Design a protein around this ligand. Sequence first.
Ligand SMILES: *[C@@H]1O[C@H](CO)[C@@H](O[C@@H]2O[C@H](CO)[C@@H](O)[C@H](O)[C@H]2NC(C)=O)[C@H](O)[C@H]1NC(C)=O
Ligand SMILES: *[C@@H]1O[C@H](CO)[C@@H](O[C@@H]2O[C@H](CO)[C@@H](O)[C@H](O)[C@H]2NC(C)=O)[C@H](O)[C@H]1NC(C)=O
Ligand SMILES: *[C@@H]1O[C@H](CO)[C@@H](O[C@@H]2O[C@H](CO)[C@@H](O)[C@H](O)[C@H]2NC(C)=O)[C@H](O)[C@H]1NC(C)=O
Ligand SMILES: *[C@@H]1O[C@H](CO)[C@@H](O)[C@H](O)[C@H]1NC(C)=O
Lengths: 665, 35
Amino acid sequence: DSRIGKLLGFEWTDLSSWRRLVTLLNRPTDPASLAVFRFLFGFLMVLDIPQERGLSSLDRKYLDGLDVCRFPLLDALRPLPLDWMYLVYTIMFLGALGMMLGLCYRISCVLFLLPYWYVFLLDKTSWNNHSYLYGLLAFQLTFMDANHYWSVDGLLNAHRRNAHVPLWNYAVLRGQIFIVYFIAGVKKLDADWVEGYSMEYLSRHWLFSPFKLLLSEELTSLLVVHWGGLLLDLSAGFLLFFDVSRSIGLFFVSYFHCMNSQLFSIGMFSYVMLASSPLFCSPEWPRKLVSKPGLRHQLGAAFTLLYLLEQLFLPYSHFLTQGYNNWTNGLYGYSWDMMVHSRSHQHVKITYRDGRTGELGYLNPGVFTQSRRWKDHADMLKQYATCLSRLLPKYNVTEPQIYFDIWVSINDRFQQRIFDPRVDIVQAAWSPFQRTSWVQPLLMDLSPWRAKLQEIKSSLDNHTEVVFIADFPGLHLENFVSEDLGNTSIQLLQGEVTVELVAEQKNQTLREGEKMQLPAGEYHKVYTTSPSPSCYMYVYVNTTELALEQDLAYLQELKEKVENGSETGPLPPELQPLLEGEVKGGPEPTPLVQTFLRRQQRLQEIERRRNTPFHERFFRFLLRKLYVFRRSFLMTCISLRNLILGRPSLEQLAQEVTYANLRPF
Amino acid sequence: ETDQEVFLGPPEAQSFLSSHTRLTERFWESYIYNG
Ligand SMILES: *[C@@H]1O[C@H](CO)[C@@H](O[C@@H]2O[C@H](CO)[C@@H](O)[C@H](O)[C@H]2NC(C)=O)[C@H](O)[C@H]1NC(C)=O
Ligand SMILES: *[C@@H]1O[C@H](CO)[C@@H](O[C@@H]2O[C@H](CO)[C@@H](O)[C@H](O)[C@H]2NC(C)=O)[C@H](O)[C@H]1NC(C)=O
Ligand SMILES: *[C@@H]1O[C@H](CO)[C@@H](O[C@@H]2O[C@H](CO)[C@@H](O)[C@H](O)[C@H]2NC(C)=O)[C@H](O)[C@H]1NC(C)=O
Ligand SMILES: *[C@@H]1O[C@H](CO)[C@@H](O)[C@H](O)[C@H]1NC(C)=O
């Protein structure tokens, strides 16, 4: 009858000794809510396997004979051939179905848990928070007795029909959801989130249209998007537990998750969170809608305590695995720092030096790769360097030395290098438990400049563009202005730089405020010769585009003058295809005429797309999803037939591949 | 993959400034749409 026992659901004396805690954590509870959550989670994973895991795109990711660079957690892990990958995905789908229907629950949970984690550890480029959450939820549900209510196993077995379950089954799930909310909130207590920098352009969406009736756009993007998210994370963590504030918390959580589902393309994360939201109610809620401790008892309590402690500790374990540390902390996926950092890459240069002749060449930036996350982590860069060092001898290259030059800015900062451009990554030193010595520090002292830069971004004309650069002492940048980019100028904002033109071998030392007009079509170099980092800017315009747009505007004005009745004189022969619109029985048109016709056709297509009713869009969406599912099923069937009954002749294989790729219609 | 997709010339690899007519808010946690 104590107030604490009514609020928290347990008395203080239950925590006095270990035996009483074990007795508390193994009290009977109704299994209906866990059953509903199991059904929803299984349905969502069944829908998610052919869409985000990559069952439809599996035939163009692990294609045999293709030389690709993988990024696994451990170098020992290697992908199997395509057919065995399809078998693994079939096993995962069967496990998801078994979890949804509650048929042989433990075997289905294992068959979903093991292949899922194998796929997750096979590639570090596809890690995100909502996949780590799926893995953790499957791991938790493997041990829980979720099949005692509303399941096939209950119909086929009397002993597991409407039986009691321990309380720690609910405690673990509630703790996991609360940890997700609270850690997301406390990770969003960053200087780039409380000030409105991260996700600043999200207030222009139409879903925030009512908020604009009472607030300005900047106040909408600061009060609602940024502070509201943090407050909602913490309040959703705390309010759902207590009985007084559960309804308001449910309403706010549902609204937030619907808006997140519509705004972003995260996938099934919002629906899984919505399905897990009703877990905080009484364990018998679905029923009213229709109408001495042993060994396992102690093992359950120990598992609950240790798992919750590990889930609390892991997001802050970045001081032990210092190899993966960077400008941000750790590999992405298990820190719950969602939508906190934005990156815009400017230029990536990969240089190689042959070890026998000494020739110097340049590779393509993203060759032999399928993702673009290797530009931000030292481990993935080292793996890519080793992959290139073992693949390049196939292209008449001896033992190479590979240098990287990558420019990246976080949350609208100066563009600076991330890795040292003078270090051979093939022979570099990297260990998971020691800090990398070839990662440039972030110029955090240049934080306030993000205000002043924006002013310059407002001072520009309709065609000028600007790029801001911050460079370290000793290093230099070599650049080649293209022939089209006429009227390119360089201005120094802070520090001391020297600009060298290599055509006449002439260098000038620039001070603060000085401006130079660089040549177009030649090579130039910027050296930093100051004890402190130097910040400068490139201001450039595209002359060819400007001239082409002016000529096209003149041509459109002439066409309009012809259309309105003016220009009584005979039309030029080049103007005839403008009126006719088809080049038949005549000379080939000039590239200007082709460009104008292409622009007109593109504008007409854009207008037609804009004038499209909603039901047609819904029908097209459903047709596209049906095509994805059908292609997945057909490719899986072809692979299983190849595995079981052998592989047919090439003509039949080509016919089946053509049939599997056919549009539904 | 041939010698045109793996190697680049000295002039094309050092073009730092690339203008438009040729978002930038990659948020990591966003599945890539591909059918
Ligand atoms: C090239 O330089 C800049 C763009 O890089 C532009 O110059 C501007 O010139 C107009 C002419 O009246 C002024 O109104 C602007 O204020 C100038 N912008 C500045 C100073 O930032 C223009 O595109 C080109 N100018 C020349 C002389 O070629
Ligand atoms: C233009 O000035 C730069 C400023 O240093 C000169 O660069 C240095 O380049 C020489 C190569 O001749 C190196 O030996 C030095 O080590 C470089 N300095 C630093 C600090 O690294 C450049 O040579 C000058 N250009 C001409 C044509 O004289
Ligand atoms: C500068 O603007 C011009 C505007 O034409 C861009 O040029 C076109 O370049 C693409 C190359 O990706 C060609 O496929 C088109 O045919 C060109 N348009 C023509 C010739 O009308 C150019 O890419 C921009 N950037 C640079 C560095 O010049
Ligand atoms: C040189 O490389 C090309 C293609 O990379 C190919 O002809 C062969 O591997 C080499 N040829 C000779 C003659 O070394």
